[PDB]
Amino acid sequence: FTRWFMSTNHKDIGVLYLFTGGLVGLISVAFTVYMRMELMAPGVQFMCAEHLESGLVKGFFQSLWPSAVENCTPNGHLWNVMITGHGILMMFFVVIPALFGGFGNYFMPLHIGAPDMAFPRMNNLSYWLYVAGTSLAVASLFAPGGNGQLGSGIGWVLYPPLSTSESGYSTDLAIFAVHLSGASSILGAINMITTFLNMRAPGMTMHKVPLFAWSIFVTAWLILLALPVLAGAITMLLTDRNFGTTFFQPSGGGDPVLYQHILWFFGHPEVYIIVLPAFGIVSHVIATFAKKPIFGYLPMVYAMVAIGVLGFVVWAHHMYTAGLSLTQQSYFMMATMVIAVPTGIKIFSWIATMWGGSIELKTPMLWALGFLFLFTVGGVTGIVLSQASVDRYYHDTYYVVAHFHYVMSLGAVFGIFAGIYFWIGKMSGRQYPEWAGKLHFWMMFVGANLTFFPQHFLGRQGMPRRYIDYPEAFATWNFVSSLGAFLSFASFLFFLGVIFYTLTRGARVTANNYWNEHADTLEWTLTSPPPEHTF
Amino acid sequence: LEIIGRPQPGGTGFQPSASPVATQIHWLDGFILVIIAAITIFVTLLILYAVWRFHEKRNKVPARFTHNSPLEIAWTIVPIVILVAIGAFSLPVLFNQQEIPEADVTVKVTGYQWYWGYEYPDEEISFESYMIGSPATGGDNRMSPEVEQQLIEAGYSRDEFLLATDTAMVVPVNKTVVVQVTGADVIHSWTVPAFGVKQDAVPGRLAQLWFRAEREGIFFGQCSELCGISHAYMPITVKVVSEEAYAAWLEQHHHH
Ligand code: HEA
Ligand code: HEA
Ligand SMILES: CCCCCCCCCCO[C@@H]1O[C@H](CO)[C@@H](O[C@H]2O[C@H](CO)[C@@H](O)[C@H](O)[C@H]2O)[C@H](O)[C@H]1O
Ligand SMILES: CCCCCCCCCCO[C@@H]1O[C@H](CO)[C@@H](O[C@H]2O[C@H](CO)[C@@H](O)[C@H](O)[C@H]2O)[C@H](O)[C@H]1O
Ligand SMILES: CCCCCCCCCCO[C@@H]1O[C@H](CO)[C@@H](O[C@H]2O[C@H](CO)[C@@H](O)[C@H](O)[C@H]2O)[C@H](O)[C@H]1O
Ligand SMILES: CCCCCCCCCCO[C@@H]1O[C@H](CO)[C@@H](O[C@H]2O[C@H](CO)[C@@H](O)[C@H](O)[C@H]2O)[C@H](O)[C@H]1O
Ligand SMILES: CCCCCCCCCCO[C@@H]1O[C@H](CO)[C@@H](O[C@H]2O[C@H](CO)[C@@H](O)[C@H](O)[C@H]2O)[C@H](O)[C@H]1O
Ligand SMILES: OC[C@H]1O[C@H](O[C@H]2[C@H](O)[C@@H](O)[C@@H](O)O[C@@H]2CO)[C@H](O)[C@@H](O)[C@@H]1O
Ligand SMILES: CCCCCCCCCCCCC
Ligand SMILES: CCCCCCCCCCCCC
Ligand SMILES: CCCCCCCCCCCCC
Ligand SMILES: CCCCCCCCCCCCC
Ligand SMILES: CCCCCCCCCCCCC
Ligand SMILES: CCCCCCCCCCCCC
Ligand SMILES: CCCCCCCCCCCCC
Ligand SMILES: CCCCCCCCCCCCC
Ligand SMILES: CCCCCCCCCCCCC
Ligand SMILES: CCCC[C@@H](O)[C@@H](O)CO
Ligand SMILES: CCCC[C@@H](O)[C@@H](O)CO
Ligand SMILES: [Ca+2]
Ligand SMILES: [Cu+2]
Ligand SMILES: [Cu+2]
Ligand SMILES: [Cu+2]
Ligand SMILES: [Mg+2]
Ligand SMILES: [O-]
């Protein structure tokens, strides 16, 4: 019944976030399958203007069959709507709702011995704001938009003056969607912070809080400072579009580059908001399956605090070619490089935790080991891009796309999967079949690497971002990258099968702690699933 | 003229360099690439060794240590030293890149939806540049027999589709070219990979870049800030020629 959706218990809200994030993730991954169908070969074969003259549903199915070039009039607007929709959904309505709204709401109270969040009704409201935002985002795809078509083709960061000139009101719906998503995140951050400070179990000193709870705590602070700034930036877009202001229009003395500073002041913290809870999950998972306590618990906490703080003074590395002076360019490059030192401490301490342990290679551990390797690949190309002298070549190329998919879709997403296989028994009372989790991992490991490692080559050869079509010479590595994305998609449908199998007919969980003694936090002292009313 | 600044089938490296700045970038990137490949291989071999050496069937009683201070001091200082070495080589390169020398040739570039306008203020020359295959040339941004014919007549082949433009920005070899970039409607971005230059074309702002081309040939770039529906269809052609071939081109534009 709809008694799930009006629940105010942190465990039920966590599950609603997880499922909703998973469903929206499926939609956005489907967009990328269509994207990679069109990028599989030079020339435009799918995104034809001819498909617009038919109806919405009829034109949809025509869009999925290739046409010869001579019968296909390229429709760059549909490309730009797809990639904009894909990025908005991921950055606002998929991975943070799953890690922070999902695992954070479920397990952070359990980890600190709290019975619930401080404001359970605020928590339930935060979930509905997330669903309201998600619905406006999706609605904008079907609203009148740029170039007399539907949808907004302006990229997920909505740069003006393109975003303030785009016709229709699709862009206004997208801005409202981002407002609702930030509201949802701010309410969650308030709940996490109040609960963390005020409702720890007696004896749970701050230097005894588990690392996941720490990561949610630090993440909640980043949200409180970053998201109000974003609300400002995008409200100024709304008033330039609709209420005659000129913040970003040079005719009226505005500056489009001013928007970039405000937006990226949120924009870089956003990615550390994404990844910090994944860091927390990796620490719990690696400690459990190495059968060894986490190496350097206190450096782990401080490194997350250092990363969170530095994440607020590096934003202009997204603007090296936007007209930054040489002095700003040199500062932001040097501030950005510092982030590698705390992050390296965590990477080395995760290996140190494995070192001398007794290692069990079960599915959650596979995801965490993949995280270590693949996040490192993404993080070192982030350091490359931090060199403004080299970012001159790579900016707005697929080398950037390769970078952020390794840290996000082979990093943060591996943390999401590590968490799901780690905790599905604890949340549901049913266990996943081990062989299928391993097969999911290896299919995703091979496919995601085939998808994104060749995009380094495309970037080095100069392929720009946000292109419906590309010169003939980029064909080989675009082809390999599309095959990898199709395999990755197969691996994700299989995963949805594995989850459906687990929840309907998975082996019954009988133990409170079905792993081992080194899963030593409070949720493993409760039943699977924990009782309806905790502590 | 040789087609030099272009992507090549199956390429994994940079486009060929044709400026000293591009040469610097190739070297700095190769230097950093060896370092980050060393770091990544190192991290990966550690994980694979630890999984092999400490697998539960091979090490059955886990250790319990959570500190090692010589190692933590090492693995904090060595990254800091690696990064300072990178910064020491890369800040000069950045400084050479962004300090604008004195121009031998000055070109003012304006980005439009969806084409580029060029003005040579010393020469009172101005023209617009459209993709061969764009509506301006009769196409609709796709390959066709007509588009292939236009590419051949302009001195290219069907392989240069989406890169070749109807007009080119012509500059003399071994001269300092200063380009002033702005946007007319939305933000665009002007770039030539073979020169190692890229600068956003922002409405209301005039920004500068420089290059000195070290050999003659043809070099392509593509617009590099999503600007709307034909973002993929407004490229850049630069022809670097001899001093007098350049003068010849100038004279052909002079109105008597
Ligand atoms: C999970 C999300 C996530 C994370 C964690 C990161 C992490 C980092 N990112 Fe990334 N980034 C994005 C998501 C993320 N990024 C997105 C979405 C974009 C594009 C936005 C857009 O335009 O749409 C982007 C783009 C982006 C740019 C702008 C590039 C451009 O547009 O031209 C830059 C600039 O430097 C950057 C750098 C970094 C750096 C230095 C880190 C560091 O935090 C990484 C540090 C980690 C390591 C370095 C590896 C581990 C460390 C060691 C093993 C120690 C030893 C290593 C050394 C000594 C180097 N990234
Ligand atoms: C979380 C962030 C995230 C994730 C997971 C992805 C996933 C993928 N993305 Fe990307 N992408 C972005 C963030 C992300 N992306 C952003 C910010 C942009 C910029 C948009 C812009 O330019 O404005 C972008 C743009 C971008 C481009 C460049 C478009 C262009 O410049 O024209 C391409 C190219 O192929 C691409 C492809 C893919 C593919 C094939 C996948 C995947 O198919 C790879 C395989 C992954 C899976 C199969 C499953 C992933 C799991 C989840 C999402 C978890 C949810 C599930 C549960 C909770 C159970 N996306
Ligand atoms: C697990 C589920 C994942 C679902 C993945 C769906 C994969 C669908 C593949 C599309 O099929 C190919 O599409 C190409 C178009 O990109 C065509 O290219 C060919 O045909 C075109 C004509 O339409 C030419 O222009 C091309 O140059 C030529 O290579 C090609 O014929 C066709 O076989
Ligand atoms: C792509 C998405 C990713 C998937 C995420 C993992 C899924 C999370 C677990 C599913 O939800 C659980 O299902 C159980 C069903 O057995 C419920 O038990 C419940 O069972 C009874 C109702 O079925 C209730 O009365 C009890 O309170 C309760 O123990 C439990 O509450 C609920 O949380
Ligand atoms: C749309 C995406 C499509 C993705 C395609 C996925 C293909 C799935 C392969 C099905 O074959 C399975 O292989 C398992 C592994 O071999 C078998 O487990 C068997 O073998 C395991 C040992 O590895 C045991 O743990 C199991 O109990 C035992 O059932 C299982 O029976 C069998 O059905
Ligand atoms: C869209 C793509 C959808 C694809 C979804 C596929 C994912 C679901 C995997 C289900 O696999 C099950 O795994 C069990 C292994 O865990 C097997 O039990 C087998 O193994 C047990 C031994 O471990 C025995 O006790 C059982 O009787 C025996 O049937 C069982 O046969 C097999 O069906
Ligand atoms: C409710 C809202 C919509 C929910 C969306 C999720 C839909 C996914 C349905 C997947 O269900 C699974 O389908 C497989 C068959 O297609 C079965 O695996 C079967 O086939 C596999 C591959 O052969 C074998 O490995 C297994 O042994 C065998 O159980 C599996 O049992 C079954 O549970
Ligand atoms: O390319 C070499 C570069 O050297 C000098 O730049 C120095 C600068 O003077 C110092 O302030 C230092 O901190 O930064 C740069 C390090 O390379 C020259 O001033 C510069 O013109 C020259 O290009
Ligand atoms: C089933 C809905 C999810 C979206 C699938 C991705 C395909 C998108 C096709 C776009 C067709 C243009 C109207
Ligand atoms: C030779 C005529 C075209 C044959 C290839 C058609 C491929 C269609 C794949 C559709 C994929 C739907 C998701
Ligand atoms: C009523 C116009 C919208 C105002 C939004 C906030 C404007 C303040 C700008 C603050 C600069 C960044 C915090
Ligand atoms: C980067 C992750 C690699 C982890 C190594 C996995 C080795 C698994 C060997 C088989 C174990 C039993 C299935
Ligand atoms: C008990 C057998 C171990 C289960 C392993 C399942 C995955 C095997 C490797 C699959 C590789 C797919 C690319
Ligand atoms: C020259 C036509 C190329 C057609 C390649 C289509 C391959 C489809 C791959 C699907 C694989 C899914 C795992
Ligand atoms: C450690 C990850 C770096 C990935 C970048 C790949 C670069 C490929 C270099 C090929 C150069 C060919 C000359
Ligand atoms: C570690 C850097 C390797 C060297 C890079 C190759 C230089 C490419 C351009 C050199 C051509 C000079 C005219
Ligand atoms: C308005 C003319 C712009 C240039 C068009 C093409 C360039 C002509 C070639 C110049 C000399 C080549 C050897
Ligand atoms: C770790 C800080 C890196 C800074 C370094 O790259 C340069 O500033 C040194 O010249
Ligand atoms: C080489 C011809 C130079 C002619 C010169 O006077 C013109 O460019 C001025 O308009
Ligand atoms: Ca295509
Ligand atoms: Cu950033
Ligand atoms: Cu443009
Ligand atoms: Cu553009
Ligand atoms: Mg840009
Ligand atoms: O970022």
What residue of B is the nearest CA neighbor of A384? B32
Residue A472 and residue A14: Cα distance in Å, rounded?
A: 47
In this structure, which long-range contacts are made by residues A234-241, counting pairs with CB atoms below 8 Å and at least 24 apart in sequence? A234/A158, A234/A175, A234/A178, A234/A179, A234/A263, A235/A175, A235/A179, A236/A262, A237/A158, A237/A160, A237/A163, A237/A164, A237/A171, A237/A175, A238/A172, A238/A175, A240/A160, A240/A164, A241/A163, A241/A164, A241/A171, A241/A172
CB atoms within 10 A of CB A331: 15
DSSP-assigned states of every residue in A11-62? HHHHHHHHHHHHHHHHHHHHHHHHHHHHHTSSS-SSSBGGGGSS-HHHHHHH
Residue A82 lies in a domain: yes
Distance between Cα A427 and ligand 7 center (Å): 21
Partners of residue B59 in chain A, C-beta under 8 Å: 356-359
The alpha carbon of residue A333 is apart from the nearest alpha carbon of chain B, in Å, by 9
Whether A140 is in a domain gets the answer: yes
Residue A244's CB is within 10 A of a number of other CB atoms, namely 8
Closest CA to A113 of A527, A528, A526, A532: A526
Contact A177, A88 (CB under 8 A): yes
Rounded Cα gap, residues B175 and B246, in angstroms? 11
d(CA A67, CA B201): 35
The two three-digit tokens of residue A262, written as one number: 């405000």
Instruction: Measure the CA–CA gap between B197 and B107, rounded to whole angstroms.
Output: 14
The verdict on the CB of residue B92 being under 6 Å from ligand 8 is yes
Look at A147 and B196 and tell me if their CB atoms are within 8 Å.
no
Pull the structure tokens for residue A496. 């949805």
A265 and A259 Cβ atoms separated by less than 8 Å: no
In the β-sheet with B207-212, what is the strand arrangement from edge to edge? Answer: B125-129, B115-120, B105-112, B176-183, B207-212
Resolution (A): 2.5
- Cα distance from N-terminal residue to C-terminal residue, chain A: 26
The Cα–Cα gap between B236 and B132 comes to 11
What is the rounded distance in angstroms from the CA atom of residue A448 to the CA atom of residue A378?
13
Q: Which residues in chain A have their CB less than 8 angstroms from residue B163's CB?
A: 471
Ligand 8: nearest atom to the Cα of B93: 1
Strands B105-112 and B115-120 turn out to be antiparallel
A-chain CB neighbours of B236 within 8 Å are none
| Contact of B160 with A470, CB cutoff 8 Å | no
Q: Is residue B234 a contact partner of residue B116, using CB atoms and an 8 Å limit?
A: yes
Query: How far, in Å, from the CA of A262 to the mean position of ligand 11?
Result: 9
**Which 276-295 residues of chain A touch chain B by CB within 8 A?**
290-295
Q: How many H helices and E strands in chain B? A: 4, 11
Distance of CA A474 to the CA centre of its chain: 28
Question: Regarding beta strands B236-241 and B217-221, do their DSSP bridges make them parallel or antiparallel, or are they unpaired?
Answer: antiparallel
Can you say how many angstroms the Cα of residue A64 is from the centroid of all Cα atoms in its chain? 27
Task: Annotate B90-124 with b (16+ C-beta within 10 A) or e (fewer).
Answer: bbebbeebbeeeebebbbbbbbbbbbbebbbeeee
Using the 8-state DSSP alphabet, how is residue B194 labeled?
G
Close Cβ partners of A474 (under 8 Å, ≥ 6 residues apart): A42, A458, A461, A463, B7
In the numeric block, which tokens belong to residue B76? 């904090």
Count of CB atoms within 10 A of residue A99's CB? 29
Alpha-carbon gap, residue A218 to A209, rounded angstroms: 13
Q: Is A353 exposed, middle or buried (0-12, 13-18, 19+ CB in 10 A)?
A: buried
Task: Report the SS3 class of residue A531.
Answer: coil
Is the CA virtual torsion A11, A16, A17, A23 positive or negative?
positive
A442 is written with which tokens?
């290896």
Q: At what angle do helices A105-112 and A413-428 cross, to 10 degrees?
A: 70
Q: How far apart are CA A403 and CA A449, in angstroms?
A: 12
Contacts 24+ apart (CB under 8 A), A434-440: A434/A362, A434/A363, A436/A494, A436/A498, A436/A501, A437/A362, A437/A363, A437/A366, A437/A498, A438/A363, A438/A366, A439/A494, A440/A363, A440/A491, A440/A494, A440/A495, A440/A498
CA–CA min distance A9, chain B (Å): 36
Q: Spell out the residues 6+ positions from residue A262 whose beta carbon is closer than 8 angstroms to its own.
A: A229, A230, A232, A233, A236
The token pair at A201 is: 């179990």
Helices (H), chain B: 20-53, 69-98, 145-153, 243-253
Domain that holds residue A497: 2-525
Residue with tokens 């390797």: A373
Residue B72 burial by Cβ neighbours in a 10 Å radius (0-12, 13-18, 19+) = middle
Q: Across the interface, which of B63, B94, B144 has its CB nearest the CB of A329?
A: B94
Angle in degrees, CA B52, B57, B60, rounded to 5: 105
Please tell me the distance from the alpha carbon of residue B32 to that of residue A393, in angstroms, as a whole number: 15
A201: exposed, middle or buried (Cβ count in 10 Å: 0-12, 13-18, 19+): middle
B65: closest CA of chain A, how far (Å): 7
d(CA A489, ligand 14 centre) in Å: 13
A79 annotated ligand-binding residue: yes
**Which of A34, A486, A494 maximizes ligand 14 atoms within 8 Å of its Cβ, making it the mutation to test the pocket?**
A486
The three-state secondary structure class of A269 is helix
User: Residue A216 region, left (φ>0) first, then alpha (ψ -120 to 50), else beta?
Assistant: alpha
Q: Quick check: is A533 in a domain?
A: no
Tally Cβ neighbours within 10 Å of residue A442.
12
Token readout for A345 is 């401490």
Could you give phi then psi for residue B198, rounded to 5 degrees?
A: -165, 130
Which ranges in chain B are annotated with CATH 2.60.40.420?
A: 102-254
Distance CA A36, CA A34 (A): 5
* CA A39 to ligand 3 center in whole angstroms: 10
Give the separation between CA A412 and CA A437, rounded to whole angstroms.
18
- Regarding the beta carbon of B218 and ligand 17, being less than 6 Å apart is answered no
Report CB contact under 8 Å: A326, B59: no
The answer to whether A155 and A466 have CB atoms below 8 angstroms apart is yes
Residue A535 maps to a domain: no
Burial class (CB within 10 angstroms; exposed 0-12, middle 13-18, buried 19+) of A272: buried
Q: State how many domains chain A has.
A: 1
Q: Whose CA is nearest to atom 3 of ligand 9?
A: A27
Cα–Cα distance measured from residue A229 to residue A249, given in angstroms and rounded to the nearest whole number = 20
Burial (CB count <10 Å: 0-12, 13-18, 19+), residue B82: buried
State the smallest CA–CA distance between residue B217 and chain A in angstroms: 18
Q: Which residue has the least CA distance to atom 2 on ligand 11?
A: A236
Prior bond of A355 cis (ω within 30°): no
Q: Which residue has the tokens 């869009």?
A: A63
Give the number of whichever ligand sits closest to the CA of residue B248: 19
Contacts of A161 in chain B (CB under 8 A): 185-187, 203
A147: left (phi over 0), alpha (psi -120 to 50) or beta: left
Residue A311 CA to residue A223 CA, distance in Å, equals: 12
| CA-wise closest residue to A10 among A170, A141, A111, A117 | A117
B168 Cβ below 6 A of ligand 17: yes
Would A520 be classed as within a structural domain?
A: yes
* CB atoms near residue B168 (< 10 Å): 23
Residue A532 lies in a domain: no
The CATH architecture assigned to B102-254 reads Sandwich (2.60)
Structure-token pair, residue A200? 């720890």
Residue list for the binding site of B:
188, 200, 223, 225, 227, 231, 234
DSSP annotation string for A100-114: IIIIIHHHHHHHHT-
Sign of CA dihedral A426, A429, A434, A436: negative
Give yes or no for A70 touching B (CB within 8 A). yes
Q: What are phi and psi for residue A233, nearest 5 degrees? A: -50, -50
B211: left (phi over 0), alpha (psi -120 to 50) or beta: beta
Q: What is the CATH number of the domain that holds A11?
A: 1.20.210.10
- Tell me the pairing of strands B207-212 and B176-183: antiparallel
Which residue from A224, A348, A441, A476 is spatially nearest to B78, judged by alpha carbons? A348
> What is the distance between the alpha carbons of residues A391 and A396, in angstroms, rounded to a whole number?
9
| Rounded distance between C-alpha atoms, residue A147 and residue B114, angstroms | 13
B49 and A CB contact within 8 Å: no
Strand pairing category for A430-431 and A507-508: antiparallel
Cα–Cα dist A272/A250, whole Å? 33
Cis peptide upstream of residue A299 (ω within 30 degrees of 0) = no
| Tokens standing for residue B21 | 């700045």
Question: Across-strand partners of B108?
Answer: B119, B180
Show the tokens assigned to A95: 């991975």
Closest-CA residue to A495 (of A34, A33, A29, A107): A29
**Is-contact B106 B121, C-beta < 8 A?**
yes
- Please state, in angstroms and rounded to a whole number, the distance separating the CA atoms of residues B150 and A335: 50
Residue A530 is assigned to a structural domain of this protein:
no
- Alpha-helical regions (H) of A296-433: 297-310, 326-338, 340-354, 363-386, 388-394, 398-407, 413-428
Q: Give the torsion through C-alpha atoms of A56, A59, A64, A68, to 10 deg.
A: -160
What is the three-class DSSP state of A397?
Answer: strand
Residue B89 alpha carbon to ligand 12 centre in Å: 39
SS3 A75: coil
Q: Which two tokens stand for residue A510?
A: 């009988």
Exposure string of A360-390, with b = 16+ CB inside 10 Å and e = fewer, is bebbbbbbbbbbbbbbbbbbbbbbbbbbbbb
Domain B6-101, what fold?
Answer: Helix Hairpins (1.10.287)
Other Cβ atoms less than 10 A from the Cβ of A54: the count is 13
Active site residues of A: 86, 116, 156, 184-185, 268, 270, 272, 283, 317-318, 343, 346, 465
Query: Is B210 within 8 Å of B194 (Cβ atoms)?
Result: no
Other Cβ atoms less than 10 A from the Cβ of A502: the count is: 21
Whole-number Cα distances in Å, B57 to A358, A359, A495, A519, B221? 8, 8, 29, 20, 57
Verify whether ligand 18 is closer than 6 Å to residue B61 (CB atom).
no
Provide the sign of the torsion angle of the four alpha carbons A158, A160, A161, A164, taken in this order: positive
Task: Please tell me which residue of chain A has the smallest CA distance to B91.
Answer: A330
Backbone angles phi, psi at B165, to 5 degrees: -115, 165
Residue A380 backbone phi and psi in degrees, to 5: -75, -30
Helix (H) or strand (E) holding A241: helix A211-242
Distance CA A318, CA B225 (A): 12
What span, in angstroms and rounded, lies between the C-alpha atoms of A480 and A482?
A: 5
Q: Are A44 and A79 in contact (CB under 8 A)?
A: no
CA-closest candidate to residue B170, choices B111, B208, B138, B217: B217
Chain B residue with the nearest C-alpha to that of A470: B162
- Alpha carbon distance A191, A124 (integer Å): 11
Which segments of A461-474 does DSSP mark as H helices, in order?
none
Q: Is B99 in the pocket of ligand 8 (CB under 6 A)?
A: yes
| Cβ A219 vs Cβ A193: under 8 Å | no
CB A191 within 8 A of CB A123: yes
Rounded Cα gap, residues A372 and A335, in angstroms: 24
User: Which H or E run contains A149?
Assistant: none
Q: Which ligand is nearest to the CA of A507?
A: 6
Query: How is residue A261 written in tokens?
Result: 């500073």
Give the Å distance between the CA of A435 and the centre of ligand 21: 38
Task: Give the position of tokens 């938009």.
Answer: A145
Longest distance between any two alpha carbons in chain A, whole Å = 73
Whole-angstrom distance, CA of residue A79 vs CA of residue B161:
19
Task: Say if B146 is an interface residue toward chain A (CB within 8 Å).
Answer: no
Q: Which of residues 194-233 of B touch A (CB under 8 A)?
A: 196-200, 202-205, 207, 221-233
- If we measure between CA atoms, which residue out of A35, A88, A108 comes closest to residue A419? A108
Closest Cα to atom 2 of ligand 17: B167
Count Cα atoms within 13 angstroms, Cβ side, for A238.
Answer: 14
Q: Chain B window 86-145: which residues touch A at a Cβ cutoff of 8 Å? A: 86-87, 90-91, 93-95, 97-99, 140-144
As a whole number of angstroms, the distance between CA A47 and CA A65 comes to: 10
- Nearest-by-Cβ selection for B90 from A355, A359, A387: A387
* A121-137 exposure pattern, b = at least 16 Cβ within 10 A, e = fewer: eebbbbbebbbbbbebb
Q: Tell me B48's DSSP state.
A: H
Residue with tokens 């070297």: B27
* d(C-alpha A517, C-alpha A288), whole Å: 8
Judge whether A534 lies within some domain: no
Residues A77 and A150: their CA atoms lie apart, in Å, by 9
* CA separation for the pair A153, A290 (Å, rounded): 47
DSSP A200: P
The residues in A 206-225 lying below 8 A from B, measured between CB atoms, are none
The CB of A351 under 6 Å from ligand 12? The reply is no
- Write phi, then psi, for B26 (nearest 5 degrees): -60, -40
Query: What's the rounded Cα separation, in Å, for the pair A276 and A379?
Result: 14
**Nearest by CB: B142 against A69, A334, A369:** A69
Burial A277-297 (b: 16+ CB within 10 A, else e): bbbbbbbbbbbbbbbbbbbbb
Report the greatest alpha carbon distance in chain B. Answer: 93
